[PDB]
Design an enzyme around this catalytic site. Structure first.
Site, PDB file in Angstrom:
ATOM      1  N   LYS A 148      62.161 -37.364  10.931  1.00 23.02           N
ATOM      2  CA  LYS A 148      62.333 -36.808  12.292  1.00 23.02           C
ATOM      3  C   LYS A 148      63.298 -35.587  12.237  1.00 23.02           C
ATOM      4  CE  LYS A 148      66.142 -39.836  12.990  1.00 23.02           C
ATOM      5  NZ  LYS A 148      66.738 -41.028  13.617  1.00 23.02           N
ATOM      6  N   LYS A 158      79.658 -38.571   2.971  1.00 24.36           N
ATOM      7  CA  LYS A 158      79.248 -39.675   3.792  1.00 24.36           C
ATOM      8  C   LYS A 158      80.132 -40.860   3.446  1.00 24.36           C
ATOM      9  CE  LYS A 158      75.218 -42.413   4.869  1.00 24.36           C
ATOM     10  NZ  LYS A 158      73.767 -42.177   5.151  1.00 24.36           N
ATOM     11  N   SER A 166      75.664 -45.843  12.908  1.00 28.87           N
ATOM     12  CA  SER A 166      76.023 -47.241  13.131  1.00 28.87           C
ATOM     13  C   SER A 166      76.843 -47.767  11.960  1.00 28.87           C
ATOM     14  CB  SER A 166      74.763 -48.106  13.316  1.00 28.87           C
ATOM     15  OG  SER A 166      73.699 -47.369  13.923  1.00 28.87           O
ATOM     16  N   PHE A 167      76.526 -47.297  10.752  1.00 27.62           N
ATOM     17  CA  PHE A 167      77.095 -47.851   9.539  1.00 27.62           C
ATOM     18  C   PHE A 167      77.934 -46.846   8.740  1.00 27.62           C
ATOM     19  CE2 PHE A 167      74.576 -51.453  10.658  1.00 27.62           C
ATOM     20  CZ  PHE A 167      73.298 -50.999  11.014  1.00 27.62           C
ATOM     21  N   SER A 168      77.838 -45.555   9.086  1.00 26.60           N
ATOM     22  CA  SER A 168      78.527 -44.500   8.329  1.00 26.60           C
ATOM     23  C   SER A 168      79.042 -43.348   9.189  1.00 26.60           C
ATOM     24  CB  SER A 168      77.642 -43.974   7.193  1.00 26.60           C
ATOM     25  OG  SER A 168      76.444 -43.391   7.677  1.00 26.60           O
ATOM     26  N   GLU A 199      66.140 -34.907  13.500  1.00 27.22           N
ATOM     27  CA  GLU A 199      67.567 -35.181  13.453  1.00 27.22           C
ATOM     28  C   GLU A 199      68.022 -35.244  11.985  1.00 27.22           C
ATOM     29  OE1 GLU A 199      68.834 -39.140  14.842  1.00 27.22           O
ATOM     30  OE2 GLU A 199      70.958 -38.638  14.585  1.00 27.22           O
ATOM     31  N   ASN A 200      67.107 -35.614  11.105  1.00 27.23           N
ATOM     32  CA  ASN A 200      67.451 -35.740   9.707  1.00 27.23           C
ATOM     33  C   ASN A 200      66.684 -34.778   8.761  1.00 27.23           C
ATOM     34  OD1 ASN A 200      65.013 -37.053   9.308  1.00 27.23           O
ATOM     35  ND2 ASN A 200      65.909 -39.127   9.396  1.00 27.23           N
ATOM     36  N   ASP A 210      61.710 -42.913   8.292  1.00 28.20           N
ATOM     37  CA  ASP A 210      62.422 -42.527   9.492  1.00 28.20           C
ATOM     38  C   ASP A 210      62.511 -40.999   9.530  1.00 28.20           C
ATOM     39  OD1 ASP A 210      63.697 -42.984  11.912  1.00 28.20           O
ATOM     40  OD2 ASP A 210      65.676 -43.314  10.983  1.00 28.20           O
ATOM     41  N   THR A 212      62.953 -44.457  14.303  1.00 27.21           N
ATOM     42  CA  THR A 212      63.191 -43.957  15.650  1.00 27.21           C
ATOM     43  C   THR A 212      61.903 -44.036  16.461  1.00 27.21           C
ATOM     44  OG1 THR A 212      64.588 -42.392  14.541  1.00 27.21           O
ATOM     45  CG2 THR A 212      64.291 -42.114  16.937  1.00 27.21           C
ATOM     46  N   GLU A 271      71.008 -29.807  12.341  1.00 21.10           N
ATOM     47  CA  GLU A 271      69.740 -30.490  12.580  1.00 21.10           C
ATOM     48  C   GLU A 271      68.664 -29.524  13.064  1.00 21.10           C
ATOM     49  OE1 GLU A 271      70.637 -33.599  15.475  1.00 21.10           O
ATOM     50  OE2 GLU A 271      72.038 -34.672  14.167  1.00 21.10           O
ATOM     51  N   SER A 292      75.332 -32.433  -0.400  1.00 20.31           N
ATOM     52  CA  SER A 292      75.217 -31.010  -0.152  1.00 20.31           C
ATOM     53  C   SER A 292      75.484 -30.734   1.342  1.00 20.31           C
ATOM     54  CB  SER A 292      73.853 -30.491  -0.599  1.00 20.31           C
ATOM     55  OG  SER A 292      73.098 -30.156   0.529  1.00 20.31           O
TER      56      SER A 292
HETATM   57  C1  LIG Z   1      74.155 -33.047  11.331  1.00 21.17           C
HETATM   58  C2  LIG Z   1      75.200 -33.923  10.656  1.00 21.17           C
HETATM   59  C3  LIG Z   1      75.313 -35.273  11.359  1.00 21.17           C
HETATM   60  N1  LIG Z   1      74.865 -34.138   9.219  1.00 21.17           N
HETATM   61  C4  LIG Z   1      74.357 -35.279   8.692  1.00 21.17           C
HETATM   62  C5  LIG Z   1      74.180 -35.147   7.324  1.00 21.17           C
HETATM   63  C6  LIG Z   1      73.622 -36.099   6.283  1.00 21.17           C
HETATM   64  O1  LIG Z   1      73.569 -35.771   5.100  1.00 21.17           O
HETATM   65  C7  LIG Z   1      73.085 -37.443   6.744  1.00 21.17           C
HETATM   66  C8  LIG Z   1      73.244 -38.616   6.001  1.00 21.17           C
HETATM   67  N2  LIG Z   1      72.755 -39.795   6.453  1.00 21.17           N
HETATM   68  C9  LIG Z   1      72.101 -39.855   7.642  1.00 21.17           C
HETATM   69  C10 LIG Z   1      71.928 -38.685   8.405  1.00 21.17           C
HETATM   70  N3  LIG Z   1      71.264 -38.662   9.602  1.00 21.17           N
HETATM   71  C11 LIG Z   1      71.099 -39.825  10.482  1.00 21.17           C
HETATM   72  C12 LIG Z   1      72.171 -39.937  11.593  1.00 21.17           C
HETATM   73  C13 LIG Z   1      73.586 -40.019  11.031  1.00 21.17           C
HETATM   74  C14 LIG Z   1      74.484 -38.960  11.261  1.00 21.17           C
HETATM   75  C15 LIG Z   1      75.762 -39.057  10.727  1.00 21.17           C
HETATM   76  C16 LIG Z   1      76.112 -40.190   9.976  1.00 21.17           C
HETATM   77  N4  LIG Z   1      75.242 -41.193   9.752  1.00 21.17           N
HETATM   78  C17 LIG Z   1      73.993 -41.129  10.260  1.00 21.17           C
HETATM   79  N5  LIG Z   1      72.428 -37.514   7.934  1.00 21.17           N
HETATM   80  C18 LIG Z   1      74.637 -33.779   6.949  1.00 21.17           C
HETATM   81  C19 LIG Z   1      74.762 -32.881   5.761  1.00 21.17           C
HETATM   82  N6  LIG Z   1      74.410 -33.257   4.520  1.00 21.17           N
HETATM   83  N7  LIG Z   1      75.249 -31.635   5.964  1.00 21.17           N
HETATM   84  C20 LIG Z   1      75.618 -31.162   7.167  1.00 21.17           C
HETATM   85  N8  LIG Z   1      75.534 -31.895   8.292  1.00 21.17           N
HETATM   86  C21 LIG Z   1      75.059 -33.195   8.261  1.00 21.17           C
END
Ligand SMILES: CC(C)n1cc(C(=O)c2cncc(NCCc3cccnc3)n2)c2c(N)ncnc21
Length: 284
Positions: free
Chosen positions: A136, A40, A21-23, A138-139, A134, A170, A95, A89
């Site tokens: 889960k 990011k 939503s924000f990045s 996905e993160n 948060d 979530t 995920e 990194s």
């Molecule tokens: C699988 C993809 C996506 N992905 C997200 C990463 C991150 O650090 C990271 C940082 N903030 C939040 C977050 N999740 C929450 C969802 C989201 C996804 C992408 C951007 N905003 C938020 N994930 C990342 C990473 N370091 N290396 C490889 N892939 C990566």
């Protein structure tokens, strides 16, 4: 006296890894080194007018404090007129969610191994007085070697002298106290751990419904079932995490901390001290 602040020109940007939503997260190759970072990118106007400055700042502050193999690492930050960049990194295998979906569910060995890693990360996080809020699949990301790398700290809480109230994660991993008392504690992360174990084994999270309201009704009533299949020791562990009373979850401070958690029968054959150097079992 650290190296020069980097700039966008120092990078050759590649594909988008994900959007929020924000990045936005984008693969970038640094040119002087050829190292790959996940960068990011946050837009300053969007952050300011959506009132998200406290969250971006907390993200930066928290990640800078973490120094552990089970966490996405913040290597650097910079900015231009319009945007903020966090050099992160690059977690090559993506995920944890992707793998649950791909192989259906985990056998007992892989569940044990990854749950153990998640437990070590959280012990470390909580030892520093940080609640994720948060947590889960996905993160919870996976590096090239298939070890976990937990990420997404913008929504974290940093305790001081077990309190919160603003944010709700979530729907499926949300703890009851967030829905009844809107306050967060380290224990809230342990509820999310109980959901994640259930999900590794069952293949789906424990509280599911057609919308968020119904998921919340299920959470507060502790309305979920175990499949007949479910590893007995994993079932017993999950029953000691998905407890409505947060002062009664295995691993929480009131239950005497991480020792009783890591002693649980389900973790009987885990060597805790060097998990990041063990070869992870194959999925599947
Ligand atoms: C699988 C993809 C996506 N992905 C997200 C990463 C991150 O650090 C990271 C940082 N903030 C939040 C977050 N999740 C929450 C969802 C989201 C996804 C992408 C951007 N905003 C938020 N994930 C990342 C990473 N370091 N290396 C490889 N892939 C990566």
């Amino acid at each position: 006296p650290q190296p020069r602040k980097k700039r966008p020109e120092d990078f050759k940007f590649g594909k988008i890894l994900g959007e929020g939503s924000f990045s936005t997260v984008v693969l970038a190759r640094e040119l002087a080194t050829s190292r790959e970072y996940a960068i990011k990118i946050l837009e300053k106007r969007h952050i300011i007018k959506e009132n998200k400055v406290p969250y971006v700042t907390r993200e930066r502050d928290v990640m800078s404090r973490l120094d552990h193999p089970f966490f996405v690492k913040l290597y650097f930050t910079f900015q231009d007129d319009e945007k903020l960049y966090f050099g992160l990194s690059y977690a090559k295998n993506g995920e944890l969610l992707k793998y649950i979906r791909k192989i259906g569910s985990f056998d007992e060995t892989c569940t044990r191994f990854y749950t153990a890693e998640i437990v070590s990360a959280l012990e470390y996080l909580h030892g520093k007085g940080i609640i994720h809020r948060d947590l889960k699949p996905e993160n919870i990301l996976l590096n090239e070697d298939m070890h976990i790398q937990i990420t997404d700290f913008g929504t974290a809480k940093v305790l001081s002298p077990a309190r919160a109230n603003s944010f709700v994660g979530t729907a499926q991993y949300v703890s009851p106290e967030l829905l009844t008392e809107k306050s967060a504690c380290k224990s809230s992360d342990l509820w999310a751990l109980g959901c994640i174990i259930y999900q590794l084994v069952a293949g789906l999270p424990p509280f599911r419904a057609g919308n968020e309201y119904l998921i919340f009704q299920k959470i507060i009533k502790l309305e979920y079932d175990f499949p007949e299949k479910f590893f007995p020791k994993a079932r017993d562990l999950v029953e000691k995490l998905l407890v409505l009373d947060a002062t009664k979850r295995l691993g929480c401070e009131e239950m005497e901390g991480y020792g009783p958690l890591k002693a649980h029968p389900f973790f009987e054959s885990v060597t805790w001290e060097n998990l990041h150097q063990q070869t992870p079992p194959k999925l599947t």
